[PDB]
Design a protein around this ligand. Sequence first.
Ligand SMILES: [Ca+2]
Ligand SMILES: [Cl-]
Ligand SMILES: [Zn+2]
Length: 387
Amino acid sequence: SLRANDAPIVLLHGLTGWGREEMFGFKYWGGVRGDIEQWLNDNGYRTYTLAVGPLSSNWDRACEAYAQLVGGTVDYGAAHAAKHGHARFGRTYPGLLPELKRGGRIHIIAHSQGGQTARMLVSLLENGSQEEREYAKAHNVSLSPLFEGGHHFVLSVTTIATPHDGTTLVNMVDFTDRFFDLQKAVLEAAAVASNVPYTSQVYDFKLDQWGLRRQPGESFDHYFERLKRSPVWTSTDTARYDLSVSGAEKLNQWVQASPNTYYLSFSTERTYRGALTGNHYPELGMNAFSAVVCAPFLGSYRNPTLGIDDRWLENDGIVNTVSMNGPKRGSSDRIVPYDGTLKKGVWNDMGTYNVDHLEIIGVDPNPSFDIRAFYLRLAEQLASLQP
Ligand SMILES: [Ca+2]
Ligand SMILES: [Cl-]
Ligand SMILES: [Zn+2]
């Protein structure tokens, strides 16, 4: 399809993720398969990578992504910061694309929870935040342009394996310990040990606002035990909260599709239905951690109070497949099956792929998945969008 726009692509990770200089260079986008950003750039699609708080709320992540893009100091909003008890200002970025302030735009390819973040950034650009605008006036303090509303710089958003309606994984027993074991599993995939007090940061959780950071002589094992007992895990201003079925619904209540942006969604599944009671089980090849620790539960959990039933059993090892085509719980967004033409202001359901949560980004191997072809095709589709 003929390129219809020149907007660069911006990669955005989920509940795990780090920058290109982190993890000794092991890329979140590509993992053991390679470097996706490089593949796209070498193929004529200008691409950049964002790095935000993996365990932080989508709100914090959107403010971080905003500053990373246009440049400046992260501003979480005076009202938000006062309400949750963390700093109003985060770190300062030089800005990857300052031209966004003069008419330039971008496409966002987001994986996992990154899809919630991408949607929220678009929502905030378009409408800002009334609570933040009022608070600033009443307290005589400045207001980030992000909260003013009337802004727009994202032409398209593609989400991959995103828990738009949340994931039932959060309702599991010891989800807390198992979620951090997931972090440890990802560290191992990147050939990083969790019982070594690395002097270099290696994996920065970007918890500047919470005043948290791995200490000199501290291992990730020990650090994660501290994080489990910290606000980035125990408060409502967290990825943990937004990841739940409850939290994702509350998010869907205000984060709606903008009529000025094209949304594409890719779903993932890596399970088979058994013959006992119709539960789903991990297929051979699923990354070990999910197959053992997460798939079993996702494929069998049911909660009457939350409306969790049989449509939710199919999963990709981390997220329920039904939750990926677009937001539905508490959402008025419209989702339409890809018919050959991408439409604005709605979710274009691009289908379901037989790849798990980590294989889709190359963190776990899957020889049968032509990851390079997948991303080049996604880049071409975004490049085909009429501005
Ligand atoms: Ca695999
Ligand atoms: Cl600390
Ligand atoms: Zn926050």
